[PDB]
């Protein structure tokens, strides 16, 4: 599923991401835009053989099981395919574990490079929340 900007913002807010660990909604929407272009089905392979999955590009190296990343962990305790669902619940719940691990949203390369330090409230502007 390819979310609209405001549609995703509302789904994220409903799932408890607004101000989660102090990150305003616009941060999450911005991250998703540059990680996946709002597409729940996005996949990308990394050099080390791990794969990033779904709207927040969660890495199989640490967070989910895809059966093809030897010596990896499954800290979210889910199959990586669950992160590709039209229902964002699994991605959000895993993102909550990631962002609490000490490094905040810096875990998301695109967020660090393209959202951090910008006017992220522009990403929810106009939306009915
Ligand atoms: Cl933080
Ligand atoms: Na695993």
Curated annotation (Swiss-Prot):
Residues that bind substrate, according to the entry? 101
| Cellular-component GO terms for this entry | cytoplasm; endoplasmic reticulum; extracellular space
| Major subcellular location class | secreted
Disulfide feature: 6-127, 30-115, 64-80, 76-94
Miscellaneous comment as given in the Swiss-Prot or TrEMBL entry: Lysozyme C is capable of both hydrolysis and transglycosylation; it also shows a slight esterase activity. It acts rapidly on both peptide-substituted and unsubstituted peptidoglycan, and slowly on chitin oligosaccharides.
Q: From the Swiss-Prot or TrEMBL record, what is one GO molecular function term?
A: identical protein binding
What is this protein's function? Lysozymes have primarily a bacteriolytic function; those in tissues and body fluids are associated with the monocyte-macrophage system and enhance the activity of immunoagents. Has bacteriolytic activity against M.luteus.
Indicate the family of this protein: Belongs to the glycosyl hydrolase 22 family.
**Name recorded for this polypeptide:** Lysozyme C
* Organism annotation: Gallus gallus (Chicken)
| Name of the top EC class for this enzyme | hydrolase
